[PDB]
C-alpha cells in the first residue's frame, strides 16, 4: 500500500493505490484507501485493510457526531487530536499485527490566508502527530519511494492539476519499486483513487482524469 | 388474575 | 385497604384497554388470520414472534411494543439454546402471563394491554391452531375459535359467534372479520396470516393491492 | 395514551 | 387519587407546552422545511438527527435538548452497528415515544415537551416525506402534510390547513410557513431544510443573507 | 400538591437571590468587565472558566462555588480532549442550564444561584463579546450589552439602560458600573476583565492601587 | 474444504463440497457447508466444522431477529457488517485453532439493475470484507485451485445452469488438486451441495441436477 | 422560565 | 450559607 | 412546609451552640492565641490543622471532632499531593463551609457547631493572621481581629471589642482574653498559640506552670 | 534529541534542537521540544516525541487547572512534585518503550533574591527530581556532550544574551558529536528553539536572534 | 448532649 | 414535630437505662475496682478491653455486649498497627462516644446503654487512674472519683460521696463498693480489678473463694 | 550511598554522604540522604534516590498525621513498626529495582535513663527490624567499610563531638573503599550531612563543623 | 429485651 498527500497553491490532494495482498499473493485489486472523512478533510490509512476501513468509519462517525451534537464542526486541531487518540488506542493491537497508520489531508477554513489553507498531518506508530511543512507526505510500504519521487517532482506543483499529476507519478514510482503497491492497471482499467480538497470542499477525482494522467506518465517513461 |  | 387499590388498578386497566381499537384473530383452514383497525401506516399492532407463533395486541402502544420485543427476544434465545421446534406458543403465553402479573403487582403503573399469542402446526403436520389470550392482571385463557380484543368487544364477538364458520377459506374469513369489525373500508386495516402451508415462517403480511383483491 |  | 394525579400531570404538560413558541415542519417538493419561532440565536430549536432525519421540538430547552442528544447518539450508534441506510425515522420516533412514556411514568416531574421527527427519501429515490409527532405521554402520530407545535396551535394549524398546498416550492413554502406563523419578523426565526437532493446529509440551515434574499 | 410544591420551591429560590449581593458584567471596548460589591477580601464571586470564558455568580456561595468548579473541570476536560479553541461559552452555559434544571427537579433543596457566562473573541479575531445569563431553574438568556445579578436588580438595571453606552473604555466602564452599583468605594469591590487584547488567557484581575487609580 | 460462489446474469450461485477430515483421516462424507441464511442470501463457512455450524446458526438467528424486531430486513451492507463483526470477534478463538472463514452470496433487491443485483463478499482473517467485482470467489483449503479454474471457465457463464456447471467444475478441480476437498462420490452417490439466489429468492439446487452435471464433467475428463 |  |  | 422545617433546624443549631462553652481566638503580635473554657483535661476544643493552620470550635464534641479529623486528613493529603506551602487556611475554611452546607441540606440532623480556622504567616515572612468563622449552615465569614464561638457571644464580644488592642503581646492578650471570657482561673482553661516565630510548625499548647506564669 | 537549560544572573534559558528520528531515518526537521508550561516555567521533554508532546500538554493543563480552581498558582515545589508524579506514573510504559525524560526551568517569584530566582530541575526515570546547583543541565541522547560543553563555556554566562549563546553552542556541540541531534540547518533555515524566563515572564526567543547566534558559532568553528 |  | 421526637427518644433511653442493675467503678490505691450487681453467672457485664483498659456497662445486655466486642476489636487492631502502648483509654472512650452518637442519630432504635472506660498506668509508672463515663447520646465525662451506672444513681452516688476515701486498699474499696451499692451477698455480685501491679495485662477477675474470703 | 549512625552518651548522631550515581556515572553531588523525620527521630535511606526521597516524605507525613489526629506522638516502637510496614509493603517494587533500605536513629524520650536513650534501628530487605545494641550501624553500598571502621573507632566516642568525628571518619573510609560513596569535596566545598539528636531534639549539624572535621581527618591521613 |  501507498498513500501520498501533497499541498498545492489553493488546496491539497491525496491519492492511493488499489492493491491489497496476503503475503505475496494478490487478494484485492480495487481496494479504495482514501476516504473523504468530512466535507473539508480526507484520510488515508495504510496497513491491515480491516483496521484501515474500521478506523476510517469510526473517525468519520466521531467527527459527524461532534458536529451534530454541538452544532459546529471540530477545529482542525480537534480532528488531529481525535485521530491521534485513535492511533494510540490501537497501539496495543498494532503490536499484535493490526497496525494502522493514518495520513490526514485537510483544508483549514479558519486560516488567515485561503491560498495556504491546506494541511497535511502524519502520524507515528505511538500516536504522535506532525503537521507537515515540506508540502508532501506518504504512508505505506512504498512511502519511501513515493516521498523520494515527490522530493524531486514537487517544484512542478502549481495548481490542482499539477498536484494530481505529481501524486499519480509518485504512486507510479512507489509501485515500480515496491511489489506490495499496485501500479495503474491498464488491462483492467483500475487506477489509483484521488481526492482533491479546496475552498469548495473535498471531491473525488473522476477515474477518467486519473486514467489520462497515468497513461501520460506511462507513455513518458516508455 | 387466573385463579383456575 | 389493599382491595380498594386493586379494584382501582383493575378498573384503570379495563378503561385503558376499552379506549383502544379492536383486533380479531380468527382460526381458519390455512392457519390464523389477524385483522386490526389500524389507521396508522407505521405503527404495527400485529407482528411475528417465531416461525409458527404470531402476536396481536390491544391497548397502549409502547407497552405491547415492549412486550412484543421481549417475546421476540425470548423466542429467539430459546430457539437458539435448544432448537427451533422447541419453541411453542404455550411457553410464550406463559411468559407473557408471568410478566404481566409481575407488572400488575410490583410496578406502580399497570400495563393497559391485552395480548394474543397464536400458534399453528408446523409444515407437514395437522393440528388445531391454538390461541392464548393474556389479560392485564396476568390471566391466560385458551380460546379455540377466535379472539376479539380492545374497543367494544361484545357486539363484534356476538357477530362472530353468529357468523362462525369452521375451516373457512382466507377470502371468506377476511370478509367475515371485516364485517364483524364494522359491526370499515380497505384502508386503516392491518391484516396478517399465520400460514400453515409455508415451510418454515408462517407469518405473512397482506398489504396494499392484495387486500383490495380479496375484498 | 397511544391506543391506535 | 391516581386518576386525579394523572389528569393534573397531563394538564401540567398542556400548560407547559402552551406557554412556549410554535414550530412548523411542512413537506414540500425538495423535502421538509422547518421554521421555528426563536427569539434567541445561540440556542437551536431545530437540529439534525441523521443523514435524512431531522428533529424539531417545543417545550423547555433542557428536556428536548437532552432528548435530541439522546436521539443523535442512538442514530449514530445504530448506523455504526449496521449501516447508515438502516436508520429510519420510524425507529427514532418509536424510541422517542418509548422514552417519553417512561419519563412520564417514572419521573417525579414529567418532561413536558413535544417532538417532531421528519424523514426524507434517500438520494436517487422518490418517497413521500414522513413526519411523526410524539407527545409528553409517549403517544406517536404520523402526519402526511404538516406539523405544528407549541403556542396557540389552533389558529396557526387552521391557517396552514387553509394555505398549505402540496408540492410547494422552497420560496412558496417559506412564505406559507411565515404567513401561517403570524397567526414574525425576518430575524427571530430559525430556518432549516431537510433537502432530498443532497447526496448524503439532507439537513441544511438557511440563516442570514440567504434567508434574507429568500424572504 | 405539585402546584404548591413547584411554587414554593421557585419562591424560595427567588428569596435566595434577593438575599445575595449585586454584581454587573458589561461588554466594553476591550471585552467584558465584571464588577461586584463583596465585603470579603478572600471569597470571590468572579473567576476564570477558560481561556476566553469568564464566570460570575450571585447567590449562595458554596452552591455556585460547586458550580464554578464543575464548569472549570468541564472546560478543562473538553479542551484537553479536543482542543482549546473548541471550548466555547455557549457549551458551558448549556451545561450549567442542564445541571441547574436537574438540581431544581431532583434535589431536595434547589440552588439559589444566578450565573453569568461571558465570552470574548480569540486574539486577532473580531467578535462581539457574548453574555449568557442563567437562572435558578435553567432559563438561559443572551444579553448583548450587560448582565445585572443579585440584590435590587431593577434600580441598577434601569441606571445601566440609560447611562451604559456601547464602546466604553476601561475607565468609563468602571465609572458607569460603580455609579450604577451605588443604586461604592474602591474597597469591598471585586473587579476583573475578560480582555480580548490578551493572546491566550483573557481573564485578568485589577486590584489594589491600580484599581483605585482607575477609580 | 472448498466453497465457491459466482455471479451470473440475474443472480448468484454458491456450491460447497462434502468432506470433513480430522488430520489425514476422512471423518465426514456428507457435510453440508452452504446455508441459506435468509430468503436472499446464502453463506458458506470454511475452516473448522464446529465453528462453521455455530457461525451459520448465529448469523441466521441474528438476521431473523433484526427482521422481526424492526419489521424490515437489514440492508445488504448491514448484513455484511454483522458478519464482519462476527468474524472479528473470533480472532482470539481462531488463534487457538477455531478458524472460520465465511463467504457470502446474496441478491440485493434494492439494487437499481436486477440483472447485476448479485453480490459476492469475501472476508479475510482479521475481519475485513471485500465485495468481489470479478464475479467469482472461493474459500477453503482448495480455494486457490477453484479460483484458478473459475478464472478460465467464467467466460462460459451465461445463465444459471452454466453458472452452476462452472461452480461444480471448479469444485471438481479443487478436489482433484487438494485431498481435504471431496470430489463427487459416484459409489455412494454424494455430490456437492448448491444454492441458487435470484430475484425469486434463494433455493437449494436439487441433487439430481448436480448429479447429472458432475457425471457430465467426469465423462468429459475421462 | 426557558420555553424557547 | 453566605450570600457573597 | 419546607420553611417551617428549615427554621426548626436553624433554631435547633442555634440553641445547640448556645448551650455550649465559649471560646475566643484573637490575633496578637506573635500570631494567634486560642483560649477556651475546657474543664476536661482530655477533650480539646483547640487543635492543630497544619504547619501554620490552627483550628477551634464550639458545639457538640463528636461533630466538630469529626470535622477536625476531616480537616487534618484533607490538609495532610493536600500537602503531600503538592507541597506543604500549598496548603492555606482559606482552602480549609472553604472545605468546612462546603461540608457544613451539605450537612445542613442533606444530613438528617444538622451539625450544631461553629468553627474558626486561623492562619499565620510563614516563617521569615510578614502577613496579618487570617481568621475565618464557619457557621452551622455553611456560611463563611472573615474576622480581621477576633472570633468568639459558642455560649453567649454578646458579653464576651463587647468586653473584648471595647478592651481590644492590636499588636498586643502574649501575656497581655491572655489577660484581656480571660477578662472578656469571665464576663477565669489558672486551671480549667485550655490555651494554645499559632506562633508565627516558629520555623515550621506554629501550633503550641500552653499547659502547666507556663500558663500560670502568664495567667 | 538534546535539551539544555542554564541559569544566568537574573533568569534562566532553555533551548532544544529540532530533529526527530525513527532509528536512523530523519522523520522530523522542525520539531519543537521546549514548551512554555506557564508564565514562569518552561518544560522540555526528551525521549519519544509522542510522549513528550502528551506530557507537556497534560502538565500545562494540570497547572492551569490548579491555578483556576484555587485562584493561586502552585509553588515551584508543587510543580516539581506534579511533574515527578507524572514521570513515576509513566514508569511501566517507559519500561515498555514509551519513555520521557523532562527538564524543567523556572523562575521563583516567591524567592527572596530576584537575581538567583532561576531554577533548573532534572528528573531521572524513576521519578526522582534534583534541583541543579551547578547552573546548567541537559537531557536527551546528546546530553553528555552538551553538558561537557557547558562545563567549559559556563564562565562566559553573565546575562541573557551570553547565556543564550552558550546554550546554542552546547546544542551545536551535542549535534556535532551525536547524530540523533540536529544542528543548525542553514539550507532550510531551521534553528534550535529557545525560551528565556526572567522576572518579566517566559518568552520565546525569536528565530532571528538564534539564527545569528548559530551563524556566529558556525563562523567561529570554521 | 456533650458540648465540651 | 422533630423536637418532640428527639425528646421522646431521649426519654426512651433514660427509661431503658433506669430499669437495669447498677455498676460501681471506683479508683482505689492499686488501680480500679469494678463491682456489679449481676444476678446471672454466665453473662458478664465487666470486661477487659486492652492491657491496661477495662470496660463496664449498664443497660440492655446485647447492645453493650456488641459495643464491648467492637471496642475490643478496635483496641486489638490499633495495638497491632502501631504498638501496645499506643492504645489509651482516651481513644477508646472517644470512639465509644462517636459510635454512640452515630447510633443515636442515624439508627431508628437508639442504644440505651451507659459505658465506663477505666485506664490504669503501665507497670513501673505512677499515674492517677482515668475514668470516662459515656452516655447514650455520646456524652463523655472525665470523672476522677467514681462511676455509677444503671438503676437509680442518686442514692448510690450520695452514699459514695459520703464514703469515698482516696487511696483506700482493695478490701476497704470492696467494702465501700458493696455498702454504697446496697444503699449484698457473695453471689449475684460480679467483681473485677484493673490492677496496676500486673506487668502487662492489668485485668483480673475475683471469683470463687477469693471474693468470699475478701468480704 | 552510605549512611552511618551511632549512639553517644546522651544522644545519637546520623551522617550521610552526598554522591548519587547512575551506573558508574556521577549524576549528583549534593544529595541529602538524612532527614529529620520528627523532633526526636531522624531517618536515612539508602538505595534508589527517588524511592528514598518519597519514603522519607511519606514517613514524616505519617508520623505528623498520627500526632495531630491523636494529640500525642507515637511511641518509638510504633514509629519502628510503621517504618517496617512501609518497608515490607515495598517488597514487590524492590525486586524490580526500586530498593530502599532505611536506618532510623532516635532519642527515646520515654526511656527511664536519659544517658542511654539513643536508639538505632536497622531494617532488612523483608521489612524486619533490629534495635542495634553495639552502638553503631550503617546502610548503603559502603556500609561494610563504614561498620568495620566504626568498630575500631567506637572506643573514642564519648560525647557529641567525638561521635560526629567518628561518623565523618567512617564515611571517609567508606568513600575510600567504595566509588558509589562520595568523600569530602575540598574543591567544591561539599561535605557529608549530619544530624545530632539529644534531649533538646534533632538538629542539623552546620556545614562549618563538618568541614573542620573532614579537613582534620584528611590532614591526619596525609 | 434484657437489661441485665
Amino acid at each position: 500500500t501507498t498513500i501520498v498527500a501533497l499541498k498545492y497553491p489553493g488546496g491539497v490532494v491525496m491519492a492511493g493505490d488499489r492493491r491489497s495482498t496476503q503475503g505475496n499473493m494478490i487478494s484485492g485489486r480495487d481496494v479504495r484507501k482514501v476516504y473523504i472523512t468530512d466535507d473539508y478533510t480526507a484520510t488515508g490509512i495504510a496497513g491491515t485493510a480491516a483496521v484501515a476501513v474500521e478506523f476510517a468509519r469510526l473517525y468519520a462517525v466521531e467527527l459527524e457526531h461532534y458536529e451534530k451534537l454541538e452544532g459546529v464542526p471540530l477545529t482542525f486541531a480537534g480532528k488531529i487530536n481525535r485521530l491521534a487518540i485513535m492511533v494510540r488506542g490501537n497501539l496495543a493491537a498494532a503490536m499484535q499485527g493490526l497496525l494502522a497508520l493514518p495520513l490526514l489531508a485537510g483544508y483549514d477554513i479558519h486560516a488567515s490566508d485561503p491560498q495556504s489553507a491546506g494541511r497535511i498531518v502524519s502520524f507515528d506508530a505511538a500516536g504522535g502527530w506532525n503537521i507537515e511543512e515540506e508540502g508532501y507526505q506518504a504512508v505505506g510500504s512504498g512511502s519511501l519511494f513515493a516521498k523520494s519521487s515527490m522530493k524531486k517532482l514537487y517544484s512542478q506543483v502549481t495548481d490542482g492539476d499539477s498536484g494530481l499529476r505529481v501524486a499519480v507519478e509518485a504512486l507510479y514510482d512507489a509501485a515500480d519499486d515496491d511489489s506490495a503497491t499496485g501500479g495503474p492497471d491498464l488491462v483492467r482499467g483500475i487506477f489509483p483513487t484521488a481526492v482533491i480538497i479546496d475552498a469548495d470542499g473535498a471531491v473525488d477525482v473522476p477515474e477518467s482524469r486519473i486514467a489520462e494522467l497515468a497513461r501520460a506518465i506511462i507513455e513518458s517513461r516508455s | 388474575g387466573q385463579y383456575l | 385497604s389493599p382491595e380498594q387499590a386493586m379494584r382501582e388498578r383493575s378498573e384503570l386497566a379495563r378503561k385503558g384497554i376499552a379506549r383502544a381499537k379492536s383486533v380479531v384473530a380468527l382460526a381458519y383452514a390455512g392457519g390464523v388470520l389477524f385483522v386490526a383497525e389500524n389507521p396508522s401506516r407505521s405503527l404495527q399492532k400485529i407482528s411475528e414472534l417465531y416461525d409458527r407463533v404470531g402476536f396481536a395486541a390491544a391497548g397502549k402502544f409502547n407497552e405491547f411494543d415492549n412486550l412484543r420485543r421481549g417475546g421476540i427476544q425470548f423466542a429467539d434465545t430459546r430457539g437458539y439454546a435448544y432448537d427451533r421446534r422447541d419453541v411453542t406458543g404455550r411457553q410464550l403465553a406463559n411468559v407473557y402471563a408471568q410478566t404481566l402479573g409481575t407488572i400488575f403487582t410490583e410496578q406502580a403503573k399497570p400495563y393497559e394491554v391485552e395480548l394474543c399469542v397464536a400458534e399453528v402446526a408446523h409444515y407437514g403436520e395437522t393440528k388445531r391452531p391454538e390461541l392464548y389470550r393474556i389479560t392485564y392482571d396476568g390471566s391466560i385463557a385458551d380460546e379455540p375459535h377466535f379472539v376479539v380484543m380492545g374497543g367494544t368487544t361484545e357486539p363484534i364477538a356476538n357477530a362472530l359467534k353468529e357468523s362462525y364458520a369452521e375451516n373457512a377459506s382466507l377470502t371468506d374469513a377476511l370478509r367475515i372479520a371485516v364485517a364483524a369489525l364494522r359491526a370499515l373500508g380497505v384502508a386503516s386495516l392491518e391484516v396478517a396470516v399465520l400460514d400453515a402451508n409455508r415451510p418454515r415462517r408462517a407469518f405473512r403480511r397482506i398489504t396494499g393491492s392484495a387486500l383490495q383483491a380479496l375484498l
Side-chain angles (χ1 to χ4, degrees), chain A, chain B, chain C:
Chain A
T1 165
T2 310
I3 297 140
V4 301
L6 66 99
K7 293 190 266 275
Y8 63 88
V12 75
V13 49
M14 181 178 252
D17 82 316
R18 318 288 301 277
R19 168 175 296 178
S20 81
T21 63
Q22 303 159 6
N24 256 347
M25 200 222 315
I26 293 153
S27 60
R29 302 208 172 76
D30 37 48
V31 189
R32 313 186 110 99
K33 303 171 190 177
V34 179
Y35 298 90
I36 301 179
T37 302
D38 72 27
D39 39 349
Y40 276 99
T41 199
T43 198
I45 309 161
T48 321
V51 191
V53 170
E54 209 216 81
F55 271 5
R57 210 153 154 270
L58 210 37
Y59 185 53
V61 175
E62 175 163 40
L63 298 198
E64 183 80 47
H65 187 73
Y66 185 94
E67 164 151 48
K68 270 183 301 179
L69 275 191
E70 327 286 347
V72 85
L74 269 162
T75 59
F76 202 67
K79 304 175 177 176
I80 294 173
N81 207 70
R82 302 321 294 170
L83 198 38
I85 295 284
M86 271 180 55
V87 179
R88 209 152 30 229
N90 175 238
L91 186 71
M95 277 335 267
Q96 181 269 0
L98 296 178
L99 179 271
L101 206 39
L103 170 67
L104 193 74
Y107 192 88
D108 205 343
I109 50 168
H110 294 139
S112 63
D113 40 352
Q115 210 48 357
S116 170
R119 304 260 175 280
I120 305 186
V121 193
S122 46
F123 297 77
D124 60 9
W129 56 272
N130 214 275
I131 290 180
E132 226 68 27
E133 256 71 74
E134 80 214 346
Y136 53 91
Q137 185 57 59
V139 295
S141 75
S143 76
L144 259 58
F145 313 104
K147 260 185 279 189
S148 298
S149 181
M150 305 204 261
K151 181 187 191 169
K152 294 278 172 295
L153 297 171
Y154 196 63
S155 52
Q156 304 161 15
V157 176
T158 304
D159 60 304
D161 193 357
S162 313
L164 186 67
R165 193 249 301 147
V166 167
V168 174
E169 194 154 359
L171 282 182
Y172 184 78
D173 298 314
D176 193 51
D177 284 308
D178 182 47
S179 64
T181 305
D185 216 320
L186 282 205
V187 301
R188 286 186 179 81
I190 298 167
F191 297 99
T193 53
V195 168
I196 281 178
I197 317 170
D198 47 7
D200 309 75
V203 296
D204 274 292
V205 180
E207 194 200 26
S208 168
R209 187 143 61 116
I210 288 166
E212 270 140 34
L213 292 175
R215 288 176 227 283
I217 290 162
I218 292 166
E219 262 65 352
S220 158
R221 284 165 198 255
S222 287
Chain B
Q2 204 246 10
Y3 319 96
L4 320 177
Chain C
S1 165
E3 287 79 351
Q4 323 272 303
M6 309 297 175
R7 291 193 325 290
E8 183 85 3
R9 173 169 285 171
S10 184
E11 78 139 49
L12 157 50
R14 29 137 289 151
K15 281 184 174 191
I17 304 157
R19 46 181 267 92
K21 301 294 194 291
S22 181
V23 217
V24 58
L26 64 153
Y28 83 107
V32 183
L33 165 87
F34 303 88
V35 198
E37 45 190 17
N38 186 17
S40 60
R41 307 267 69 72
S42 170
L43 293 189
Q44 308 285 309
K45 70 183 280 143
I46 298 154
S47 88
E48 165 177 55
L49 276 178
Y50 209 58
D51 296 349
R52 332 289 295 186
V53 191
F55 170 89
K60 191 158 168 31
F61 179 80
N62 46 326
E63 271 76 5
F64 66 73
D65 197 72
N66 213 40
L67 286 184
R68 173 192 83 91
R69 289 180 175 261
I72 289 179
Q73 194 237 24
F74 174 88
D76 275 322
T77 293
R78 180 67 62 94
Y80 182 74
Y82 306 89
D83 193 28
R84 305 199 67 89
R85 285 175 159 268
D86 274 302
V87 174
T88 67
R90 179 173 62 88
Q91 317 178 357
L92 289 162
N94 278 23
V95 166
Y96 276 144
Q98 218 82 36
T99 186
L100 276 187
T102 303
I103 281 164
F104 179 113
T105 286
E106 268 278 340
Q107 204 153 0
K109 163 39 64 43
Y111 276 21
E112 301 146 58
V113 61
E114 293 282 321
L115 301 185
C116 167
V117 170
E119 205 209 71
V120 298
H122 304 256
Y123 183 45
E125 283 118 301
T126 295
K127 181 191 69 69
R128 147 160 322 122
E130 42 185 50
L131 321 172
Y132 298 81
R133 155 170 56 224
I134 307 100
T135 73
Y136 53 108
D137 41 350
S139 70
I140 171 179
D142 199 326
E143 188 175 41
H145 302 308
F146 56 93
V147 194
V148 190
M149 312 152 86
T152 81
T153 60
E154 274 59 14
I156 303 177
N158 275 113
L160 275 172
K161 303 205 81 284
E162 297 155 357
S163 290
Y164 198 76
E166 284 277 331
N167 307 50
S169 193
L170 182 50
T171 67
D172 276 323
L174 188 57
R175 177 42 105 207
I176 284 154
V178 303
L181 201 66
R182 159 72 178 91
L184 294 160
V186 298
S188 74
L189 213 76
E190 193 205 21
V191 315
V193 280
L194 283 184
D195 193 334
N197 291 7
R198 303 210 33 191
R200 192 169 63 91
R201 305 176 76 175
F203 197 79
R204 170 173 67 89
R205 284 203 181 288
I206 331 178
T207 80
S209 69
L211 267 164
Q212 175 150 337
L214 268 71
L215 292 175

